[PDB]
């Protein structure tokens, strides 16, 4: 599982640090052991569509 470049969210999601929002909180969060297992459970259902 490949993360994107970390300079993408740093020039366009947290450009102004005076404010916060719903997106600007979630960037500083890491997946747990089971919340990564749900991402593995997402991509199984994208490959077998119906």
């Amino acid at each position: 599982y490949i993360a994107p470049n970390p300079r993408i969210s740093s020039i366009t999601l947290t450009q102004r640090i005076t404010t916060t929002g719903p997106f600007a909180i979630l960037t500083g969060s890491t997946p747990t052991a089971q919340q990564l297992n749900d991402v593995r459970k997402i991509y199984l259902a994208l490959m077998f569509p119906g």
């Binding site: 600007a24 909180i25 979630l26 960037t27 500083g28 969060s29 890491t30």
Partner: peptide
């Protein structure tokens, strides 16, 4: 008590969830 700590670089956004270990 019972607090945990890991390697984090988000100074604001992860310590919000650190009080969730307190509460």
């Amino acid at each position: 008590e019972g607090d945990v700590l890991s390697s984090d670089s988000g100074p604001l956004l992860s310590v919000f969830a650190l009080q969730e270990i307190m509460q």
